[PDB]
Design a protein around this ligand. Structure first.
Ligand SMILES: C[C@H]1CC[C@H](NC(=O)Cn2ccnc2)CC1
Length: 330
């Protein structure tokens, strides 16, 4: 089997991407944030504290003839941005782009933190990291991909995120029309539960490539590119007036700037992030200070190849017995 679904930016800055997902019978379609940095499929629901729902579409398990309470199971998750959610668990039929999994754990939120409430466009998350990170207790549950994998034509999914435009998540096949040149594959460590790999270095603009190992994660659920402070300083030093602002919470730059590109290495291959991809717009409405899309990972404890990086590539998440990652230009 295969599936193919369009993923759409939630706003004009590509702050996140949503993908429609069918849950239950009859189908309830929710727009979920596909997150290769986490491993829980959770949704706003009829069980979510009413004051914490503000415009989201909810899953109502009592209206699904295939929903079954997973008795005794609870979940609770916190993310790197400080947001969180928790609740109980159903199993139900879940389909993405024509690919159907029966008995998928659908984690129903009883509580969500303020940032989730405040974002009306995201109805939940669909985790695509390794199932070892799944938070369901006392019986850990599998991701949608983990459940689907054996049925797929090939045990892979691909992320093809757009810049200020829709893109595609495919399951079970590689669309050879969706990228240019060849896909370069690189080793993955699953030891921390992530799609963790080692970039071979970077360049800023038209500058020379610096060969250096940068261990990080391919994370569709993180908006920005988080790299070591040395690398980030080298980038922003090429933008007149750019500075790290403790009050804003990262590097900012004059909105009048033309940003240089940023290149990262995948083996001997190179992925070029155009400068425009690194502009996250005014820090507050009407400001001439703009927020940067490349930020320091110092104090995160891990480098994160988030959407800023991934949207410059066609990315293969290869879930074979020994997982790997593939990157192509597009
Ligand atoms: C320092 C960084 C700050 C931004 C963080 N972004 C997230 O946590 C986004 N997220 C929510 C759910 N899955 C992903 C990542 C760490």
């Amino acid at each position: 089997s295969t599936g193919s679904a369009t993923t759409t930016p939630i706003d004009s800055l590509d702050d996140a991407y949503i993908t429609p997902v069918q849950i239950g019978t009859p189908a309830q379609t929710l727009n979920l944030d596909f997150d290769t940095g986490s491993s829980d499929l959770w949704v706003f629901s009829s069980e979510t504290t009413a004051s914490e729902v503000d415009g989201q579409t909810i899953y109502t398990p009592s209206k699904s003839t295939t929903a079954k309470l997973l008795s005794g199971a609870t979940w609770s998750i916190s993310y790197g941005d400080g947001s969180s959610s928790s609740g109980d668990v159903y199993t139900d039929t879940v389909s993405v782009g024509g690919l159907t999994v029966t008995g998928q754990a659908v984690e129903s939120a009883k509580k969500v933190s303020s940032s989730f409430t405040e974002d009306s466009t995201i109805d939940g998350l669909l985790g695509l990291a390794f199932s070892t990170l799944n938070t369901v207790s006392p019986t850990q549950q599998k991701t949608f991909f983990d459940n689907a994998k054996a049925s797929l034509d090939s045990p892979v999914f691909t992320a093809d995120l757009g810049y200020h435009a829709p893109g595609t998540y495919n399951f079970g096949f590689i669309d050879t029309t969706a990228y240019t040149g060849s896909i370069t594959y690189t080793a993955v460590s699953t030891k921390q539960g992530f799609w963790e790999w080692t970039s071979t270095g970077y360049a800023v603009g038209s500058g020379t490539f610096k060969s250096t190992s940068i261990d990080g994660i391919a994370d569709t659920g993180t908006t920005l590119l988080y790299l070591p402070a040395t690398v980030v300083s080298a980038y922003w030093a090429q933008v007149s007036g750019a500075k790290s602002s403790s009050s804003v919470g990262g590097y900012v730059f004059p909105c009048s700037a033309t940003l240089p590109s940023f290149t990262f290495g995948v083996g001997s291959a190179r992925i070029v992030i155009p400068g425009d991809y690194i502009d996250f717009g005014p820090i507050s409405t009407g400001s001439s200070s703009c927020f940067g899309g490349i930020q320091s990972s110092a104090g995160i404890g891990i480098n994160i190849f988030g959407d800023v990086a991934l949207k410059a590539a066609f990315v293969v998440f290869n879930g074979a017995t020994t997982p790997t990652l593939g990157f192509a230009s597009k």
